Amino acid sequence: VDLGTENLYFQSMIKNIVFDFGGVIVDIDRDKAVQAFIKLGLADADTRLDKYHQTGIFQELEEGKLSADEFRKQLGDLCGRELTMEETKQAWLGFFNEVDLRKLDYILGLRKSYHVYLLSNTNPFVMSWACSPEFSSEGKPLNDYCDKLYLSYQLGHTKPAPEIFDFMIKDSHVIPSETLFVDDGSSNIHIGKELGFETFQPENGADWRQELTVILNS
Ligand code: NA
């Protein structure tokens, strides 16, 4: 079938759509991330890095408890050498594959009919790329695809903490039952459901456009 927006029709009680970034808009490859951090000297990266919820200094960075520079310093101490910001950024970008422009185009089409928000565990290294014209070959920052970004490191909590969902709900004024939450992570989906959201859990790396269209018309 043809998933171009002009072919698509939308009608249901859903008014808002909340997307995660990694695992939904852009593919995550944890093995590639592990390799990228090992390159810096983090020889035990395989035990440290997670697909859904970081721990240790990685969590602290994604909750804004460590600044990018502070994280760089503490990561360097683990690696036994002083890291630059650029090589630390490049390690973080190891988590990601280039974006499927089909997904970005689909999301632009959604904005004609829905309020679209991002709610994501992320950090300044990743966002310096995503929230810039370097995000993709289309030259539009992640900001162009949403009404507002809710970023863990600016809010002090990471999903699946209920607090990050609560901030987003209160700030955006969405009614959870009229909102579709799209996230590849099970724990995040479960708390979203508990708080009243409709949920859709796509597979990381999969083309979810068809199924999303079906859900938005259910
Ligand atoms: Na995700």
Side-chain angles (χ1 to χ4, degrees):
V1 304
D2 191 29
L3 301 171
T5 309
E6 220 72 22
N7 297 118
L8 303 188
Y9 196 69
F10 297 122
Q11 185 60 273
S12 74
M13 287 183 181
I14 299 295
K15 293 177 177 148
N16 320 289
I17 304 173
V18 178
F19 289 100
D20 194 8
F21 182 63
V24 175
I25 293 175
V26 184
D27 301 349
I28 296 308
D29 188 333
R30 199 194 72 99
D31 282 352
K32 190 154 77 61
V34 165
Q35 288 292 307
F37 281 88
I38 288 172
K39 177 172 177 176
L40 297 182
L42 195 63
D44 59 358
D46 186 51
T47 299
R48 294 181 190 267
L49 302 183
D50 198 72
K51 212 180 312 176
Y52 306 112
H53 182 89
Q54 310 307 329
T55 61
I57 61 169
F58 292 82
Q59 170 169 21
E60 287 169 4
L61 174 71
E62 300 217 320
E63 292 177 358
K65 296 180 178 185
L66 286 182
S67 69
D69 196 30
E70 288 175 315
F71 170 87
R72 178 203 59 80
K73 193 272 181 194
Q74 294 185 32
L75 178 63
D77 292 345
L78 287 182
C79 292
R81 79 156 178 96
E82 181 103 348
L83 304 174
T84 67
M85 288 289 274
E86 186 63 25
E87 68 187 316
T88 303
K89 178 177 173 175
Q90 291 308 313
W92 273 107
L93 295 182
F95 267 102
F96 304 96
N97 293 328
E98 289 288 358
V99 64
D100 182 358
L101 296 174
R102 298 180 302 178
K103 289 181 174 179
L104 292 188
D105 286 354
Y106 184 95
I107 292 168
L108 284 181
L110 290 176
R111 297 197 66 192
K112 312 193 194 307
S113 299
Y114 300 94
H115 302 283
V116 175
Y117 304 100
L118 191 90
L119 176 66
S120 193
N121 291 350
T122 193
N123 64 70
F125 296 100
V126 176
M127 289 299 105
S128 71
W129 158 66
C131 292
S132 82
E134 300 183 306
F135 179 36
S136 90
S137 59
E138 286 297 326
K140 296 167 66 59
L142 181 58
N143 311 78
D144 282 12
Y145 298 90
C146 309
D147 292 291
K148 184 161 180 172
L149 301 177
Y150 296 91
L151 307 178
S152 61
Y153 71 91
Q154 294 189 321
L155 301 178
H157 303 272
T158 43
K159 298 185 289 180
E163 293 96 327
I164 196 182
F165 287 87
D166 184 71
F167 179 90
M168 181 271 166
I169 291 168
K170 287 184 160 67
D171 182 78
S172 67
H173 312 308
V174 302
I175 302 297
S177 72
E178 298 176 339
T179 304
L180 184 69
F181 175 54
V182 187
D183 195 308
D184 61 309
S186 293
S187 294
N188 294 346
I189 289 286
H190 297 313
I191 181 70
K193 283 165 113 199
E194 181 173 322
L195 299 175
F197 291 92
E198 293 290 330
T199 63
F200 170 38
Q201 185 172 355
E203 182 176 17
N204 173 46
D207 173 23
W208 42 247
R209 295 170 304 144
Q210 182 188 10
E211 185 173 1
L212 186 47
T213 301
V214 176
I215 290 168
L216 290 170
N217 285 279
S218 292

